[PDB]
């Protein structure tokens, strides 16, 4: 997409994540795990549900119109009755083709955005205790048990407690 | 040095669909939905729209009163369905602006007939014909009144009829074209004549033309069919030397959602907002590919038979 | 503490507006402007377009030359405005395809009448009637010449009139259908006849039908109004046995921005390029909701009464 | 929006910034102030004025067209005259409805952009002397008087002179 | 020296191109491609569409068989080209709804004529005229048979001709309108006359009007031209008491992609899918400003003369 | 554009680059060089070629239609044949005008996007061994010969073998 996160610096998706659209995978001292993120998932879904309802509009509903098939050759007036209906169908076929094209381009780019937004939210939160590895993963430089991981996934991660521990693990003689 | 990794990722599906975008032509998202209804059941649901199956009767034959169409008298409808197997079994006729007369009656929505007493003086009424047999017995169109000679005489006729109600009135009448100058005198005694049907706002004048016509059900003649709308406070004014196929009354001409459609589709017990000639179709989708002829709350006809709207992110499965 | 905190942010307002987007139905921005014109003064501005208030005269009644329409001779317009209070007050007439004649005269944009002396012989000219009265004095359609018997004779006419100019000529002529057989012979001595009005390109034939018509203003007769256009180098050629309401000349007919509109709106002294039957509306918006009938540089008629185009960012306010 | 700054990590907008659209707000030892950014404000207005002018403008000038109303039942030809005009009206109503949805979706997204661009442009300036608190505010690790703050609102902020002081406040026995 | 600088950038060109966006009216990009095709050679390419050069004959004149148009008999086309230098050099005629008969014959795509033998009796055939000369030798339209009296007798013709084939049949015929009552009786020894042409589905009736018409190639008469289509199982019934311009057979009518266009452009041995009255144009672009009249696979006509689609990034050069 | 990279934090473009759409200029001990990045160049081209091919798409083959120029005054029926063709042309003109503006707006944004993607690719690649000068350039804090530079542009820069040298130059007395 235009944000380069889905099909971009995230090498692939997770078929095994069925409780959301965006989520966390972690590896720490107690083991490994996976957890969907509800905010980003609900953000993307509510946008796609919204545009979907505008598209299935619904309006129209016509009753007595013009005849559109003819069993006799008639000439001028019939040439017009056909040209009008033909003109209209091409114009609506165009609208329908362009609508799906524009919408799908936007459906992809917004789902790309929601991924990038969840990454930036996580980046700001970790502050100076983690480095971006480049694949949507963070290396967290301090002991971060399940409580610490959970405090990131919910938005209550206090970087200050781990800052001194993390800053030392980053700077030395590697 | 006990570190920990935290990875951010997304949603992936084994069974993605290809959608279409501004830049790519086929691209796999996790999920999409169809926007073009392309299938029908092939049957017309009998509700919510009040269907009136014309069967062997066309709307004009029902209007005029073809004897085998008597069961359509004073019938109302939301959608009249004309069938290809229909026919005519009364006097041979032809309607200039047939499409127009059929159009305005179809949109009126009813064949509600109201009789009126035209003061014809000196003329024998209720003319019959072998070509329009009502079971081996002779008769004519039910809503038309054939005037011919009374005691080897025909007086030049004149009648007024006003519209004192608050609604437009539709009058259907005709003019007879005998096939030989013989028949012309044996019916109206005169050699040829004029029929002058007028209102304050309209004017109609017909001269009959004697001459042979293609043999149909016994007779080589024909009737021409004309219509006249008389608004409130206006007048209908017949004036005729002969050859007049007189009206018996008017039809209430209304405006509404009513229409007409040609289709041989069977009518089934179900419910569907949208009707097409080849069957009722659903209208949950915004576009449809079944037929450009529709009636009711329908999707818009388009040339495409499929347009998938993506409802998910790009699917990037197991690499 | 060696501290400093720099914050970045965006502005906000208390009173934001809701707008439609691709994703959301109602979402609040800080400022939007309306794109649909939905209001009018109720009055028509008489500039920059040259308006012609028809008053009690239809464009057809001015064309033919009604007495009370005398004030429209040789007049021009960009938008002719027919009123619902309009009436006729001359001989009863009817016009086959009235809508077409009105349409073509309206787009022509003038009634500039040129006199022409046709070479009618043996026939009384300038016939008048009790219906078209210019005071107590009986007179007739100003642009039409009623031909009738002279010394109890009417000789079959034949008259030409070539178009020796560079532009199109428009002739408005007619045919008389009298109420009685008696009136036919008092005016034209002979029975019903043929009026044949052709050109090199056109061809028109009318057969007068004597009959009783709706009694109007003293007469139970009627006049069928027809028209003809003569190309440069072409020739108008009339051939009438009788029953001819002959033209006094031609109208010049060219093309341009002229048209016609039915409306009862008063006319003030303002300036608005866009006219609707409801009055002038300002064309500063790209769409409008006043009327689908428009004349001039107008917004395009849509079905919505409001489309708010957001002209600001999201409104995010307080906590 | 798609950049997640307005109605994003910026929790709300300053209802009392009357002199601009985007701007700064500070606290140093001297006092607390506020000032709008002319560059980002003018950027957003000129894009919105630009699209406004394309959307307003002429030209639709029509003079003699078909009759849109009818007092008489005429049938076939009037059926067509009605159908032609009705067909035209639905198509334009669609064009208008879609136009406003696209413009407003983009009007919102481009303003969300200009917020994020001013933020990133600022972080490129402070380089290694400040930290992103994640709410739209920077924490600056050196003494920055009002002339120093004012030097951030223009390209004049020379990070070289504050680098040594800032790094020490960032890294110490915490 | 402990240092290395890595700059990232994008390209530029010295000469950009201005394009339109949602935001700007003009903005520079490194590249664009035109979308409006607004030029042509001025020459209709004779392939891949079967072109037929009408030269001096309107399609109606070739249909009827004007002598100077005998080349065009039994021709086929995908596009018939009518030239502004076309003249008519036979008997004078006019066609009510000329436009329609021109439209339907042009869409049928051929002039394949099949001769049939009607059993005319007591009547002289192959009537010729001074106005329609085939080499200073009097003759008439090649597809119309002029009937007149034989030995002071014109017995009432009555003849049927059924369509016992798959293809529909197109018959062309006419009614002669003599100038004087003398010409009427000299040709048909009976005043007026009558022509009645019937199918089971259609009925055309014409009464010839005697009268002087504009002088053309020595005659003051004229011929009305009528057409009639007969579907399989139907019948063609002609009943004339005089003044019939009889047909000689039927035209084979088909339904294909054929049409007709007015131009004076020359025709070359090139190849182009899209044809305009200005010569062929390339259909590589999606829109064209050449002409709203096109034939075949063409770009859509728009009003803009240029619409540039950006094919590169913003062009930002040396500051 | 909306990503603020082209005509944004990169002051201007390089007229000296003709073998790519995006690239690298560098400066080290050995001197200067210039190389175009194929991956990003190709990515922006494939999209523009895609939309160019969707826009130029064979459609619209019509044969017998209505007449559109007339040489006689006929009124009602001709008024309609003109209103029909006129209504149609205005609609396709609007479709054409809007299509160009959307595709051109998107083309600019998406190319601006690919420049930003390449920058964020290079930034993550350098981890803690360089800093953003703001002009679109990185100041690398270690000795990086032409071979080293090559590994950066080519996904093979191993930041670990320079991290100690780099951090020593970034923090010290200066
Ligand atoms: C002007 O020119 C036209 C054209 O030539 C001419 O019109 C012709 O008129 C005659 C009049 O009789 C008519 O004759 C036939 O009509 C019937 C044809 O019916 C079908 O026959 C076949 C399939 O069924 C098929 O081949 C045909 O195409 C058609 O579909 C037919 O009834 C007639 O046959 C009669 O023969 C004798 C006559 O008494 C009887 O033994 C028959 O039963 C039948 O008629 C009698 O039947 C019933 C029985 O109960 C009886 O009650 C009734 O009274 C009737 O007398 C003929 O074959 C032509 O069809 C018709 N042609 C067209 C094209 O219309 C005009 O007559 C001419 N004008 C003048 C003034 O002369
Ligand atoms: C074929 O069939 C038609 C149908 O009937 C028939 O036509 C009919 O003809 C009669 C007589 O001509 C006509 O009758 C009167 O119609 C007028 C309308 O009536 C109402 O409207 C008026 C207001 O708009 C007002 O008068 C009343 O409200 C009225 O109720 C009516 O006006 C006429 O009245 C005049 O008739 C005679 C003529 O002398 C007098 O009795 C009256 O006073 C009146 O005016 C006369 O007096 C004044 C006094 O000074 C005088 O100045 C003036 O000049 C005039 O002489 C009509 O009589 C029907 O309307 C009409 N039917 C219609 C139209 O449907 C044909 O006659 C039939 N064909 C044949 C050959 O017979
Ligand atoms: C009702 O009223 C209409 C109109 O008032 C009337 O129609 C008129 O009828 C007359 C008689 O037929 C006719 O008169 C001559 O018109 C011909 C056209 O003239 C045009 O030619 C010019 C040059 O071509 C051109 O500039 C103009 O457009 C001009 O108007 C004219 O050719 C005829 O005259 C030739 O023919 C006669 C007959 O032989 C000869 O006597 C003449 O000398 C002349 O040329 C002769 O010489 C040439 C050698 O050069 C020779 O080869 C040739 O054979 C010929 O013999 C016509 O006489 C009017 O044109 C016509 N007008 C209209 C408008 O139709 C009706 O007749 C009236 N109805 C009744 C029942 O009476
Ligand atoms: C188109 O434009 C032309 C140009 O003006 C018009 O031409 C004119 O037509 C009229 C009518 O056709 C012509 O007058 C007739 O001339 C003929 C010439 O032969 C003449 O026979 C006729 O008189 C006959 O008609 C009377 C009708 O009342 C009969 O009663 C009478 O017949 C009886 O009388 C004789 C006594 O002599 C007895 O022997 C018998 O008892 C007989 O039965 C009489 O014979 C008319 O006078 C006119 O000449 C002509 N003009 C020109 C310049 O050619 C067309 O009329 C016009 N057509 C339209 C408008 O449709
Ligand atoms: C909804 O309702 C509509 C209306 O019926 C249906 O749409 C029609 O579908 C039929 C197919 O079932 C279409 O008919 C086909 O198209 C062509 C039309 O025939 C042309 O060619 C002949 C001469 O060859 C001309 O005379 C004629 O005027 C036409 O120009 C043909 O190509 C097809 O012929 C095929 O069938 C015959 C046997 O039947 C074979 O022998 C042939 O070789 C050939 O293969 C056929 O006739 C029709 O055009 C459609 N549109 C209409 C009628 O307007 C929908 O199918 C129906 N259902 C749905 C779900 O939409
Ligand atoms: C600019 O000029 C136009 C032209 O007149 C005006 O448009 C008219 O607007 C009025 C009011 O909105 C319309 O009048 C009303 O329409 C009602 C519904 O219309 C349909 O429904 C009935 C079914 O009952 C159909 O029979 C009918 O033919 C219509 O198809 C009618 O019900 C109204 O009747 C009256 O009675 C009811 C009682 O039930 C009252 O409550 C109503 O208020 C009303 O007085 C009435 O007919 C009218 O149709 C419009 N005309 C046209 C041509 O569009 C604009 O309003 C005017 N101003 C502006 C700003 O645009
Ligand atoms: C259509 O074409 C047909 C061709 O068949 C044509 O039909 C013919 O019509 C005429 C008149 O309408 C018929 O003539 C009649 O013939 C019968 C047969 O015996 C006679 O009895 C009639 O005599 C009466 O008519 C006289 C008229 O002056 C009276 O004076 C006399 O006293 C008698 O009452 C009359 O002559 C003719 O028979 C038919 N044809 C055939 C084959 O029967 C018809 O006219 C055409 N219609 C058009 C062109 O409109
Ligand atoms: C509309 O309706 C009216 C009302 O009936 C009708 O008017 C009537 O027409 C008849 C026919 O013209 C008139 O009756 C006439 O009466 C006079 C009395 O003086 C007679 O002379 C007439 O007889 C003629 O008949 C011969 C032919 O057989 C002629 O050659 C001869 O010369 C005689 O004149 C004729 O019978 C009647 O007077 C009028 N009016 C009324 C009130 O009856 C009119 O015909 C209708 N309009 C139509 C049919 O178009
Ligand atoms: C146009 O017609 C109207 C009818 O509505 C005329 O208005 C009336 O004319 C009478 C006679 O002059 C006056 O007594 C009334 O006061 C008028 N107004 C009404 C009845 O409301 C009008 O005079 C006619 N002529 C014009 C407008 O020039
Ligand atoms: C935050 O994490 C804690 C675990 O310490 C958990 O109890 C809590 O539910 C999380 N917050 C939310 C909003 O779920
Ligand atoms: C900010 O930069 C410009 C150029 O010097 C100017 O607006 C202003 O003087 C500067 N402000 C400060 C505080 O240097
Ligand atoms: C990428 O890896 C190293 C960089 O020095 C080099 O050996 C290799 O050739 C580079 N790739 C290409 C295509 O040259």
PDB file of N, CA and C in Angstrom, chain C residues 167-207:
ATOM      1  N   UNK C 167     -32.052  34.218 -46.386  1.00  0.00           N
ATOM      2  CA  UNK C 167     -32.416  33.654 -45.095  1.00  0.00           C
ATOM      3  C   UNK C 167     -33.713  32.861 -45.204  1.00  0.00           C
ATOM      4  N   UNK C 168     -34.046  32.171 -44.117  1.00  0.00           N
ATOM      5  CA  UNK C 168     -35.246  31.352 -44.068  1.00  0.00           C
ATOM      6  C   UNK C 168     -36.478  32.209 -43.803  1.00  0.00           C
ATOM      7  N   UNK C 169     -37.564  31.898 -44.507  1.00  0.00           N
ATOM      8  CA  UNK C 169     -38.864  32.521 -44.293  1.00  0.00           C
ATOM      9  C   UNK C 169     -39.782  31.538 -43.583  1.00  0.00           C
ATOM     10  N   UNK C 170     -40.579  32.039 -42.638  1.00  0.00           N
ATOM     11  CA  UNK C 170     -41.560  31.225 -41.922  1.00  0.00           C
ATOM     12  C   UNK C 170     -42.950  31.800 -42.162  1.00  0.00           C
ATOM     13  N   UNK C 171     -43.797  31.034 -42.846  1.00  0.00           N
ATOM     14  CA  UNK C 171     -45.169  31.433 -43.121  1.00  0.00           C
ATOM     15  C   UNK C 171     -46.119  30.684 -42.196  1.00  0.00           C
ATOM     16  N   UNK C 172     -47.084  31.407 -41.637  1.00  0.00           N
ATOM     17  CA  UNK C 172     -48.116  30.835 -40.780  1.00  0.00           C
ATOM     18  C   UNK C 172     -49.441  31.030 -41.499  1.00  0.00           C
ATOM     19  N   UNK C 173     -50.040  29.936 -41.953  1.00  0.00           N
ATOM     20  CA  UNK C 173     -51.309  29.968 -42.669  1.00  0.00           C
ATOM     21  C   UNK C 173     -52.315  29.069 -41.958  1.00  0.00           C
ATOM     22  N   UNK C 174     -53.488  28.913 -42.565  1.00  0.00           N
ATOM     23  CA  UNK C 174     -54.535  28.162 -41.901  1.00  0.00           C
ATOM     24  C   UNK C 174     -55.583  27.649 -42.864  1.00  0.00           C
ATOM     25  N   UNK C 175     -56.556  26.934 -42.297  1.00  0.00           N
ATOM     26  CA  UNK C 175     -57.691  26.376 -43.029  1.00  0.00           C
ATOM     27  C   UNK C 175     -58.937  26.552 -42.168  1.00  0.00           C
ATOM     28  N   UNK C 176     -60.070  26.845 -42.802  1.00  0.00           N
ATOM     29  CA  UNK C 176     -61.312  27.124 -42.091  1.00  0.00           C
ATOM     30  C   UNK C 176     -62.259  25.933 -42.177  1.00  0.00           C
ATOM     31  N   UNK C 177     -62.740  25.481 -41.020  1.00  0.00           N
ATOM     32  CA  UNK C 177     -63.732  24.411 -40.933  1.00  0.00           C
ATOM     33  C   UNK C 177     -65.013  24.985 -40.344  1.00  0.00           C
ATOM     34  N   UNK C 178     -66.012  25.300 -41.163  1.00  0.00           N
ATOM     35  CA  UNK C 178     -67.214  25.960 -40.648  1.00  0.00           C
ATOM     36  C   UNK C 178     -68.190  24.969 -40.033  1.00  0.00           C
ATOM     37  N   UNK C 179     -69.011  25.492 -39.119  1.00  0.00           N
ATOM     38  CA  UNK C 179     -69.888  24.634 -38.342  1.00  0.00           C
ATOM     39  C   UNK C 179     -71.011  24.016 -39.149  1.00  0.00           C
ATOM     40  N   UNK C 180     -71.449  24.692 -40.208  1.00  0.00           N
ATOM     41  CA  UNK C 180     -72.623  24.295 -40.968  1.00  0.00           C
ATOM     42  C   UNK C 180     -72.264  24.052 -42.429  1.00  0.00           C
ATOM     43  N   UNK C 181     -73.106  23.264 -43.103  1.00  0.00           N
ATOM     44  CA  UNK C 181     -73.036  23.185 -44.559  1.00  0.00           C
ATOM     45  C   UNK C 181     -73.400  24.516 -45.199  1.00  0.00           C
ATOM     46  N   UNK C 182     -74.265  25.295 -44.546  1.00  0.00           N
ATOM     47  CA  UNK C 182     -74.689  26.573 -45.105  1.00  0.00           C
ATOM     48  C   UNK C 182     -73.545  27.578 -45.114  1.00  0.00           C
ATOM     49  N   UNK C 183     -72.827  27.697 -43.993  1.00  0.00           N
ATOM     50  CA  UNK C 183     -71.726  28.653 -43.913  1.00  0.00           C
ATOM     51  C   UNK C 183     -70.656  28.376 -44.959  1.00  0.00           C
ATOM     52  N   UNK C 184     -70.487  27.111 -45.354  1.00  0.00           N
ATOM     53  CA  UNK C 184     -69.505  26.773 -46.381  1.00  0.00           C
ATOM     54  C   UNK C 184     -69.813  27.483 -47.692  1.00  0.00           C
ATOM     55  N   UNK C 185     -71.066  27.404 -48.143  1.00  0.00           N
ATOM     56  CA  UNK C 185     -71.444  27.967 -49.432  1.00  0.00           C
ATOM     57  C   UNK C 185     -71.650  29.478 -49.385  1.00  0.00           C
ATOM     58  N   UNK C 186     -71.948  30.045 -48.214  1.00  0.00           N
ATOM     59  CA  UNK C 186     -72.050  31.497 -48.116  1.00  0.00           C
ATOM     60  C   UNK C 186     -70.685  32.162 -48.234  1.00  0.00           C
ATOM     61  N   UNK C 187     -69.631  31.507 -47.744  1.00  0.00           N
ATOM     62  CA  UNK C 187     -68.281  32.057 -47.790  1.00  0.00           C
ATOM     63  C   UNK C 187     -67.518  31.634 -49.040  1.00  0.00           C
ATOM     64  N   UNK C 188     -67.599  30.356 -49.420  1.00  0.00           N
ATOM     65  CA  UNK C 188     -66.745  29.807 -50.465  1.00  0.00           C
ATOM     66  C   UNK C 188     -67.511  29.217 -51.646  1.00  0.00           C
ATOM     67  N   UNK C 189     -68.843  29.327 -51.658  1.00  0.00           N
ATOM     68  CA  UNK C 189     -69.761  28.893 -52.719  1.00  0.00           C
ATOM     69  C   UNK C 189     -69.651  27.408 -53.076  1.00  0.00           C
ATOM     70  N   UNK C 190     -68.442  26.852 -53.109  1.00  0.00           N
ATOM     71  CA  UNK C 190     -68.279  25.457 -53.495  1.00  0.00           C
ATOM     72  C   UNK C 190     -68.254  24.549 -52.267  1.00  0.00           C
ATOM     73  N   UNK C 191     -68.312  23.244 -52.521  1.00  0.00           N
ATOM     74  CA  UNK C 191     -68.249  22.248 -51.460  1.00  0.00           C
ATOM     75  C   UNK C 191     -66.827  22.183 -50.899  1.00  0.00           C
ATOM     76  N   UNK C 192     -66.589  21.213 -50.015  1.00  0.00           N
ATOM     77  CA  UNK C 192     -65.270  21.055 -49.411  1.00  0.00           C
ATOM     78  C   UNK C 192     -64.208  20.886 -50.488  1.00  0.00           C
ATOM     79  N   UNK C 193     -63.045  21.492 -50.261  1.00  0.00           N
ATOM     80  CA  UNK C 193     -62.012  21.496 -51.275  1.00  0.00           C
ATOM     81  C   UNK C 193     -60.646  21.190 -50.694  1.00  0.00           C
ATOM     82  N   UNK C 194     -59.612  21.315 -51.526  1.00  0.00           N
ATOM     83  CA  UNK C 194     -58.234  21.031 -51.131  1.00  0.00           C
ATOM     84  C   UNK C 194     -57.324  22.247 -51.087  1.00  0.00           C
ATOM     85  N   UNK C 195     -56.649  22.457 -49.962  1.00  0.00           N
ATOM     86  CA  UNK C 195     -55.640  23.505 -49.840  1.00  0.00           C
ATOM     87  C   UNK C 195     -54.279  22.826 -49.900  1.00  0.00           C
ATOM     88  N   UNK C 196     -53.540  23.063 -50.982  1.00  0.00           N
ATOM     89  CA  UNK C 196     -52.271  22.385 -51.241  1.00  0.00           C
ATOM     90  C   UNK C 196     -51.161  23.427 -51.190  1.00  0.00           C
ATOM     91  N   UNK C 197     -50.299  23.324 -50.184  1.00  0.00           N
ATOM     92  CA  UNK C 197     -49.262  24.316 -49.912  1.00  0.00           C
ATOM     93  C   UNK C 197     -47.924  23.584 -49.914  1.00  0.00           C
ATOM     94  N   UNK C 198     -47.181  23.689 -51.011  1.00  0.00           N
ATOM     95  CA  UNK C 198     -45.930  22.961 -51.158  1.00  0.00           C
ATOM     96  C   UNK C 198     -44.767  23.921 -51.374  1.00  0.00           C
ATOM     97  N   UNK C 199     -43.558  23.371 -51.255  1.00  0.00           N
ATOM     98  CA  UNK C 199     -42.326  23.995 -51.719  1.00  0.00           C
ATOM     99  C   UNK C 199     -41.516  22.942 -52.467  1.00  0.00           C
ATOM    100  N   UNK C 200     -40.299  23.313 -52.877  1.00  0.00           N
ATOM    101  CA  UNK C 200     -39.417  22.335 -53.507  1.00  0.00           C
ATOM    102  C   UNK C 200     -39.130  21.180 -52.560  1.00  0.00           C
ATOM    103  N   UNK C 201     -38.972  21.479 -51.271  1.00  0.00           N
ATOM    104  CA  UNK C 201     -38.609  20.495 -50.261  1.00  0.00           C
ATOM    105  C   UNK C 201     -39.802  20.013 -49.451  1.00  0.00           C
ATOM    106  N   UNK C 202     -40.702  20.916 -49.081  1.00  0.00           N
ATOM    107  CA  UNK C 202     -41.864  20.551 -48.294  1.00  0.00           C
ATOM    108  C   UNK C 202     -43.042  20.213 -49.202  1.00  0.00           C
ATOM    109  N   UNK C 203     -44.125  19.775 -48.563  1.00  0.00           N
ATOM    110  CA  UNK C 203     -45.375  19.402 -49.212  1.00  0.00           C
ATOM    111  C   UNK C 203     -46.455  19.252 -48.150  1.00  0.00           C
ATOM    112  N   UNK C 204     -47.541  20.009 -48.282  1.00  0.00           N
ATOM    113  CA  UNK C 204     -48.597  19.995 -47.278  1.00  0.00           C
ATOM    114  C   UNK C 204     -49.954  20.040 -47.965  1.00  0.00           C
ATOM    115  N   UNK C 205     -50.868  19.183 -47.517  1.00  0.00           N
ATOM    116  CA  UNK C 205     -52.207  19.120 -48.087  1.00  0.00           C
ATOM    117  C   UNK C 205     -53.221  18.998 -46.965  1.00  0.00           C
ATOM    118  N   UNK C 206     -54.212  19.882 -46.973  1.00  0.00           N
ATOM    119  CA  UNK C 206     -55.270  19.891 -45.974  1.00  0.00           C
ATOM    120  C   UNK C 206     -56.605  19.809 -46.694  1.00  0.00           C
ATOM    121  N   UNK C 207     -57.474  18.924 -46.220  1.00  0.00           N
ATOM    122  CA  UNK C 207     -58.822  18.777 -46.752  1.00  0.00           C
ATOM    123  C   UNK C 207     -59.789  19.306 -45.695  1.00  0.00           C
TER     124      UNK C 207
END
